[PDB]
Amino acid sequence: KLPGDFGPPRGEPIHAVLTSPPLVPPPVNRTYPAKVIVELEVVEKEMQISEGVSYTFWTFGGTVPGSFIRVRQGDTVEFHLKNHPSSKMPHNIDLHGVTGPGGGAASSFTAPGHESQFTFKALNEGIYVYHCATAPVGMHIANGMYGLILVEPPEGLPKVDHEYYVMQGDFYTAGKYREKGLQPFDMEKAIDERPSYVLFNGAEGALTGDKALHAKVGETVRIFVGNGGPNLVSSFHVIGAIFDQVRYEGGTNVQKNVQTTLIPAGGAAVVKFTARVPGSYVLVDHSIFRAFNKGAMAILKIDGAENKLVYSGKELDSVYLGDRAAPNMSAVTKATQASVSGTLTVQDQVQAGRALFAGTCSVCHQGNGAGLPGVFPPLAKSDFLAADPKRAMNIVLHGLNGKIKVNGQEYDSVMPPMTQLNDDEVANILTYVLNSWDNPGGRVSAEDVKKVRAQP
Amino acid sequence: KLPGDFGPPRGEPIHAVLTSPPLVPPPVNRTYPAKVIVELEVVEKEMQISEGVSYTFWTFGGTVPGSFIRVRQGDTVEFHLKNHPSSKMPHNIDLHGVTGPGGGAASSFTAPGHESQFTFKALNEGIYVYHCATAPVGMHIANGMYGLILVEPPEGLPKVDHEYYVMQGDFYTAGKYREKGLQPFDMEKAIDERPSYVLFNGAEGALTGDKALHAKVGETVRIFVGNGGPNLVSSFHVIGAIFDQVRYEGGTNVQKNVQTTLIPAGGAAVVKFTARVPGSYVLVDHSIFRAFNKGAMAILKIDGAENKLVYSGKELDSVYLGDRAAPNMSAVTKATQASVSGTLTVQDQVQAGRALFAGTCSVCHQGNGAGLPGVFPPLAKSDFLAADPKRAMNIVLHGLNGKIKVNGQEYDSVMPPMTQLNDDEVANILTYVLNSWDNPGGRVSAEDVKKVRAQP
Amino acid sequence: KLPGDFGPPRGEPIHAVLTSPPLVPPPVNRTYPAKVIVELEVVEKEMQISEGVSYTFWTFGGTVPGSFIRVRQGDTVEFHLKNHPSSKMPHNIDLHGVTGPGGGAASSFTAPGHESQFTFKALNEGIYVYHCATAPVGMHIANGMYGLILVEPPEGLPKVDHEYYVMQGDFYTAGKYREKGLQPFDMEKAIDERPSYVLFNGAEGALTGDKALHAKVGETVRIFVGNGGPNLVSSFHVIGAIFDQVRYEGGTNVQKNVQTTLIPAGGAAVVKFTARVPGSYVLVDHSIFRAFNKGAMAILKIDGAENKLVYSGKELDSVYLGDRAAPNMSAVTKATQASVSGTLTVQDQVQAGRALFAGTCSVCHQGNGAGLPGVFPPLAKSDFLAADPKRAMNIVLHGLNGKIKVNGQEYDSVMPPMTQLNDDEVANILTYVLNSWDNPGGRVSAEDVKKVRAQP
Ligand code: HEC
Ligand code: HEC
Ligand code: HEC
Ligand SMILES: [Cu+2]
Ligand SMILES: [Cu+2]
Ligand SMILES: [Cu+2]
Ligand SMILES: [Cu+2]
Ligand SMILES: [Cu+2]
Ligand SMILES: [Cu+2]
């Protein structure tokens, strides 16, 4: 027989349990093959890809990644795809692990306001990517149309304390990283494989701060990890920990005791972790500019007792987590809304600036602006700043080097340029600095920075 | 002893059987080591990389990839490399799996009109890439100078019903994707790893349509899969199927039951597939813009009985295969030749347009131009089109959104821009539309589109 | 218990042995767990990244990669990080394989002139990357802040004849490849993952020529191979040889008998090789333009007896090693220093030109300039050259094709353009040619070439 030769469906039909990221449906917990009815709906919708940055996502079930599907090897799946009448595009679905043309795409073409159905037997056990396969296929995937389906072995996977759902994607906006507003899809960047954002679960901060994943010392954690692409291959890594097991798709090979593992575009793996020490453990794409310049960081936060014989040291994790160490950056979202409304206050700028200053400026000038005498000059009550507060704009954009004096002390060092910061970010950061630590006050506007950036 | 320690060559010398892609030489079918004489000739030649697009390829044996070589572990190989007198460049060969300096490159330097020879023992069993290694090495490989050599284990590989030869490459043209004419090699794009085409077996459509690979339900298929690069790593994937086995080079590890697998630049693998359901199964690089925007798709077509218990559904595979669902796009080749000759007719444009309309326009407007009332407006007998047929050029190039009325019906939707289409493609598509479904007729020229594209 | 549960530290504390690339510390050779004290110092310093090209590296222990650390599974490590007072930036360390927040980064933040300490138990056996994790993390890694730590199994690794240390990195300069002078870090190229150099051990030629690694026929060689990134994934390959074993990090899986293997960004592997035939064996990133256009080549040179039954052929390895076949390119370094001083002589140019002519020109015109009658025209005593020595600049920059006559002989062929060469390189090469083989003499300057390059 073929694989998954376990007998005809038995019992009543089961209406499948779909879940939203980062959660997973429960184990099916049964010893017989069933007829499973799956109902999934496409919705096109604006969501925030970053604070104050909107994007028109195309979604399976209202989220990126799409709703998680869970069935048993040998089940017969009757798949119903609906396309909501508000959609502008037609859509379909290709499930990896399906035995048949297009993995379903050939049979699931669905116009706005319509519904399609096709039936397949789940012959192949494993974790699998699904995605839209409507021309132009790359545009549909780039807009968020991907998720995971798990096909369990007949005895089920081994029990663990937590199961989570994490999926990487590369995204292509017309504007640069953190440029505010509604950002269109950019076909030219996509063809060139030059993404502006690389994310877990559809947004910067989706899994950081108050949205981190949780477990306790001693517990086991399984993560179902997808790479929707469309184009990038992930050097997938956990900072400060190790994977007990890594298994790709439905493969017979299992790797154990590794920290860094390559996930193909369109690939999926199951990883297992055992919590040993408290703190924040970071999932990244270790093609490092993705993790630290484009959004590709997620957090598993572990609580419980210290083990000083295993790890003993201070805990200053803002040095690398930067502006994602805090619970959120909601002050930036709020300042951006107020600016669009024409109601932006000095305090709106101050609080947005405070959020952005973490990492970006604090690593050298300190969280309190004091710096370090002779090494990093102070921003707190800075005579150099007060002497020409406008020159601060050029210093942020283009850097500063050479001999200077600040609060009666000599410095001869190098502050690198930070031209990648957007006009609103520079304005908000400097407004924060002017209104803290007994500095003179006032404000800097995005338009002020735009003028300075444009000077030859 | 070393590996492959099977004794001295015995019997008469064997003159090796070389084959052209996508075919493989027969199994050697012998139990003793032999002296094998290999004769391979370099030829530089123009071929079509895409319909109406010519390129000067550099080849081993007249094809891209080059002729397939098949020997037994423990054989002594006497390798003769000839460089045809029509060649402009010198050439050589590096075979992966050879034990010695440059894998042969050090001993096989050959000027136009000359011949070289060197001898090696095949110590290492496996599938291996060979390629040119003449400075500048990257240029030689980018021009097509790569292929595969199989070194069999002494007992031979297990029997299968079919063996095929498929090799990925990245290519660098001065012009953009599908821009017509003789296209030079582009060194700047190559250094930046920004290819214009990513292909199987040296051309768009090399393995699609009437050139697809074949098998029947129940049969086993082995594919020898190479990645010549020069630069890209393939997220190699089969749509709608699974690999029974994947084995890299001569490695001891074998992965089983996977659908997606990473092939390094310069790497090679042997994959095995068992046919279960009829239809078209697609080999792709799942870095998806390569597969659907740059040519990286090949087809295995399976015939035999349906199995409705495994897969039951409609078969509209043009939604993702697009303009490669048809047997070929020969109308485009012909229209391009006629244009170069100054003899391009309206009907030449109509038939080229018909070929290009599949996927590109048909996914929303339908194959018959009827659209879908209230959702996608008709192109068939379109009053909006007839009212200003020239405005159609701007609509294709730059998109259309907002409220419009077409054949007495309101629409308020979004047609994305399609600026990547070349001037001849837009002209031919629109000429097809004007001369179908009782539209007014006439024609649009490439020069008309060039003028509109250049407007601010 | 956890892993590495071998008992409390015993004996006196051990002060750890650190080594500079390409060497490794000795095996620890002990049967008990110890307290190991590690002292490592950050130094920021200018070094030559290529001949006549300086770069400001940020280093662990004065080298790129940083000092190699070697401990035993179950050891307690007391880690002291110092930042030299000459540093301008703060720094820290993340060791892969550490169980705890940031792999240490959270506890090791260290300002210029300061020292930090933290303690960890080495629970996980394997080879692991360490690196700086100070915001902006990508800039710190791109500047050279990475190395390897080995955690031995309790019984030690199997004995071999040689152990070596090789680490790949991608680098981002404002200037182009081989443009002379002090080159700043380029943030824009880094974000886009578009490196100007891709190197082993921090420089072009670090492991070629007189700096090659050595072994003899019959000996075993272990290489500890890292990929510091920040961004690239290596298609890591040995030309003309095979790896007996490849093992990633501390993984349970071991691959055997492969030639090409994918190393993730931030990944590390241990490879094993047995020398079988004399000659130069080349370690490369087989994303080929990295190996042959950006510096990603290193050499293992094997001495001993020939084995003509395994490999029999000539040895012209300059056809692919090009300008790295020679012991060094010190003439280029010297010509660049003299030019900066205003003391550049004709002979300085001649010797720099001689070094650069290897591969670049010699593959077609020969090492003696004679060419090949009717196929490649001579540069030796060339009447065509003497007739208009200035036209030689355009020929190098923009190529030459069509019918020409040279020393009473007809040619109708194609010399590709070589625009990637810098102004000093073209000037030096042509000065070499003018002063060899009874050509007229004189000189060409970098300023002459700059003027010609700028002509429309
Ligand atoms: C990596 C270190 C570093 C980072 C990050 C950094 N700075 Fe600086 N900054 C310096 C150094 C060093 C100087 C002194 C330059 C000199 O000696 O010529 C400086 C000088 C300045 C000055 C002028 C002198 C003074 O004390 O008033 C201002 C204002 C300033 N920085 C603001 C900022 C702001 C705002 C940020 C973040 C957006 C930032 N800096 C990020 C190192 C840094
Ligand atoms: C993804 C959907 C989609 C694709 C693909 C697409 N179109 Fe359209 N097209 C539309 C929609 C929707 C409109 C109506 C726009 C509006 O409501 O403002 C439209 C409008 C038009 C119109 C003007 C209205 C009419 O019916 O005459 C023309 C002409 C047209 N398309 C031609 C084409 C051609 C030719 C192609 C391919 C080259 C193409 N379209 C591809 C969705 C699409
Ligand atoms: C791949 C082959 C190749 C390489 C590499 C190459 N050349 Fe040439 N070169 C030629 C050919 C062929 C011609 C003749 C062109 C023709 O027939 O129109 C030529 C012509 C010339 C000429 C003019 C004719 C003569 O003999 O005086 C000069 C000068 C020259 N090359 C110099 C160089 C220099 C200097 C280099 C390296 C920097 C170089 N070439 C690299 C193939 C090459
Ligand atoms: Cu879709
Ligand atoms: Cu897919
Ligand atoms: Cu060649
Ligand atoms: Cu190779
Ligand atoms: Cu650092
Ligand atoms: Cu790391």
Q: What is the per-residue DSSP string for C162-195? A: EEEEEEEEEE-BSSPTT--EEPPB-HHHHHTT--
Q: Give the torsion sign (CA, C121, C126, C132, C133).
A: negative
Taking the C-alpha atoms of residue C190 and residue C143, their distance in angstroms, rounded to an integer, is 11
Number of Cβ pairs closer than 8 Å across A and B?
A: 188
Give ∠ CA B315-B320-B324 in degrees, rounded to 5: 95
Taking the C-alpha atoms of residue A21 and residue B345, their distance in angstroms, rounded to an integer, is 56
Kindly determine whether residue A312 and residue C119, on different chains, have CB atoms separated by under 8 Å.
Answer: yes
Taking the C-alpha atoms of residue A242 and residue A256, their distance in angstroms, rounded to an integer, is 9
Q: Are B284 and B291 in contact (CB under 8 A)?
A: yes
Contacts of C190 in chain A (CB under 8 A): 289
Number of H helices, E strands in chain C: 11, 24
Burial class (CB in 10 A: 0-12, 13-18, 19+), B303: exposed
Kindly determine whether residue B251 and residue C257, on different chains, have CB atoms separated by under 8 Å.
Answer: yes
Contacts of A133 in chain B (CB under 8 A): 319-320
Nearest to B285 by CA among B205, B169, B194: B169
Q: Are C101 and A317 in contact (CB under 8 A)?
A: yes
Q: Are A94 and A114 in contact (CB under 8 A)?
A: no
Nearest to B79 by CA among B122, B141, B43, B129: B122
Angstrom CA distances, A386 to A377, A379, A389, A438, stand at: 14, 10, 5, 11
Taking the C-alpha atoms of residue B251 and residue B232, their distance in angstroms, rounded to an integer, is 22
Q: Is A211 helix (H, G, I), strand (E, B) or coil?
A: helix
Angstrom CA distances, B251 to A260, B100, B449, C244, C256, stand at: 21, 19, 54, 10, 5
Nearest to C94 by CA among C124, C43, C132: C132
Q: Are A79 and B314 in contact (CB under 8 A)?
A: no
CB-CB neighbours of C398 under 10 Å: 15
Give ∠ CA B252-B256-B257 in degrees, rounded to 5: 165
Tokens of B211: 């050139």
Q: Is C330 helix (H, G, I), strand (E, B) or coil?
A: helix
Tokens of A267: 């690939």
Q: Residue B105 is nearest to which of C237, C309, C319, comparing CB atoms?
A: C319
Taking the C-alpha atoms of residue C359 and residue A30, their distance in angstroms, rounded to an integer, is 68
Report whether residue C396 contacts ligand 3, using a CB cutoff of 6 Å: yes
Q: Is B131 helix (H, G, I), strand (E, B) or coil?
A: strand
Which residues of B carry a binding-site annotation? Answer: 91, 94, 96, 131-132, 140, 145, 286, 361, 364-365, 382, 413, 415
Nearest to C225 by CA among C270, C292, C289, C291: C270
Burial class (CB in 10 A: 0-12, 13-18, 19+), B114: middle
Q: How was this structure determined?
A: X-ray
Whether the CB of C252 is below 8 Å from some CB of chain B: the reply is no
Taking the C-alpha atoms of residue C330 and residue C52, their distance in angstroms, rounded to an integer, is 9
Residue of C nearest to B7 (CA): C309
DSSP 8-state assignment for residue C25 = P
Tokens of C74: 């179950």
Give the CA radius of gyration of chain A: 25
Nearest to C439 by CA among C329, C333, C373, C365: C365
Report whether residue A432 contacts ligand 1, using a CB cutoff of 6 Å: no
Q: Which residues touch C12 (CB under 8 Å, ≥6 apart)?
A: none
Chain-centre distance for alpha carbon A187: 21
Taking the C-alpha atoms of residue A35 and residue A80, their distance in angstroms, rounded to an integer, is 13
Give the CA radius of gyration of chain B: 25
CA of A277 to the centre of ligand 9 (A): 18
Pocket test for ligand 3, best of C319, C350, C364 (most atoms within 8 A of CB): C364
For the residues of B17-37, what is the DSSP string, one character each? --B-TT--PPP---SS--EEE
Residues with CB under 5 A from ligand 7 (ion): B 266
- Domain B157-329 grouped into CATH 2.60.40.420: yes
Nearest to B53 by CA among B182, B186, B202: B182
CA distance A294 to chain C (A): 9
Angstrom CA distances, B207 to A94, B45, B161, B189, stand at: 22, 21, 19, 26
Burial class (CB in 10 A: 0-12, 13-18, 19+), C390: exposed
- Which residue bears the tokens 């200035």? C390
Q: What number does CATH give the domain B1-156?
A: 2.60.40.420
Q: Give the helix ranges, DSSP H, for B273-382.
A: 288-293, 318-321, 330-341, 346-357, 362-365
Kindly determine whether residue C258 and residue B265, on different chains, have CB atoms separated by under 8 Å.
Answer: no
Give ∠ CA B281-C235-B241 in degrees, rounded to 5: 15
Q: Are B122 and B97 in contact (CB under 8 A)?
A: yes
Q: Are A297 and A317 in contact (CB under 8 A)?
A: no
Give ∠ CA B267-B268-B273 in degrees, rounded to 5: 145
Q: At what angle do helices B346-357 and B330-341 cross, to 10 degrees?
A: 150
Asked whether this chain's domains A157-329 and A330-456 adopt the same fold, the reply is: no
CB-CB neighbours of C61 under 10 Å: 20
3-state secondary structure C99-153: CCHHHHCCCCCECCCCEEEEEEECCCCEEEEEECCCCCHHHHHHCCCEEEEEEEC
Give the CA radius of gyration of chain C: 25
What are residue C324's phi and psi, to 5 degrees? -100, 5
The enclosing H or E element of B53 equals strand B53-60
Report whether residue A449 contacts ligand 1, using a CB cutoff of 6 Å: no
What are residue A198's phi and psi, to 5 degrees? -130, 115
Tokens of C394: 């355009």
Q: List all residues of chain B from 409 to 448 with a beta carbon under 8 Å from chain C.
A: none
Taking the C-alpha atoms of residue A343 and residue C424, their distance in angstroms, rounded to an integer, is 58
Tokens of B431: 């000429």
What are residue C333's phi and psi, to 5 degrees? -55, -50
Where on the phi/psi map is residue C161: left (φ > 0), alpha (ψ -120 to 50), or beta?
alpha
- Which ligand approaches the C-alpha of residue C358 most closely? 3
CB-CB neighbours of A323 under 10 Å: 21
As assigned by CATH, the class of the C330-456 domain is: mainly alpha
DSSP 8-state assignment for residue A184 = P
Q: At what angle do helices C423-434 and C330-341 cross, to 10 degrees?
A: 110
Report whether residue A370 contacts ligand 1, using a CB cutoff of 6 Å: no
Prior bond of A154 cis (ω within 30°): no
Taking the C-alpha atoms of residue C172 and residue B217, their distance in angstroms, rounded to an integer, is 53
- Which residue bears the tokens 């079918």? B29
For chain A, give the number of residues: 456
Taking the C-alpha atoms of residue B350 and residue B358, their distance in angstroms, rounded to an integer, is 13
Pocket test for ligand 1, best of A415, A428, A434 (most atoms within 8 A of CB): A415
- Which residue bears the tokens 């300042």? A335
Taking the C-alpha atoms of residue B84 and residue C106, their distance in angstroms, rounded to an integer, is 64
Burial class (CB in 10 A: 0-12, 13-18, 19+), B408: exposed
Q: Are A29 and A157 in contact (CB under 8 A)?
A: no
CB-CB neighbours of B276 under 10 Å: 21
Contacts of A413 in chain C (CB under 8 A): 88
Taking the C-alpha atoms of residue B429 and residue B452, their distance in angstroms, rounded to an integer, is 16
Taking the C-alpha atoms of residue B262 and residue A391, their distance in angstroms, rounded to an integer, is 51
Q: Residue B251 is nearest to which of C235, C255, C315, comparing CB atoms?
A: C255
Kindly determine whether residue A126 and residue B262, on different chains, have CB atoms separated by under 8 Å.
Answer: no
Cross-strand bridge partners of residue C91: C110
Q: At what angle do helices A346-357 and A330-341 cross, to 10 degrees?
A: 150
Q: Are B93 and B79 in contact (CB under 8 A)?
A: yes
Prior bond of A90 cis (ω within 30°): no
Q: At what angle do helices B330-341 and B423-434 cross, to 10 degrees?
A: 110
DSSP 8-state assignment for residue A393 = H
β C162-171/C197-200 pair status: antiparallel
Whether the CB of A137 is below 8 Å from some CB of chain B: the reply is yes
Domain map of chain C by residue range?
1-156, 157-329, 330-456
Taking the C-alpha atoms of residue A62 and residue A47, their distance in angstroms, rounded to an integer, is 10
CA of A317 to the centre of ligand 8 (A): 15
DSSP 8-state assignment for residue C159 = P
- A94: annotated binding-site residue? yes
Q: Is A289 helix (H, G, I), strand (E, B) or coil?
A: helix
Residue B304: CA count within 13 A, CB half-sphere: 15
Taking the C-alpha atoms of residue A128 and residue A227, their distance in angstroms, rounded to an integer, is 10
Kindly determine whether residue B260 and residue A250, on different chains, have CB atoms separated by under 8 Å.
Answer: no
Chain-centre distance for alpha carbon C179: 17
b/e sequence C399-419, b meaning 16+ C-beta within 10 Å: ebeeeeebeeeebebebbebe
Taking the C-alpha atoms of residue A263 and residue A255, their distance in angstroms, rounded to an integer, is 13
- Which residue bears the tokens 């190991």? C36
Q: How far does chain A reach from its first CA to its final CA, in angstroms?
A: 74
DSSP 8-state assignment for residue A376 = B
Contacts of A6 in chain B (CB under 8 A): none
Taking the C-alpha atoms of residue B248 and residue B254, their distance in angstroms, rounded to an integer, is 8
Number of Cβ pairs closer than 8 Å across A and C?
A: 188
What are residue A152's phi and psi, to 5 degrees? -70, 150
Resolution in A: 1.8
Whether the CB of C90 is below 8 Å from some CB of chain A: the reply is yes
Residue of A nearest to B322 (CA): A135
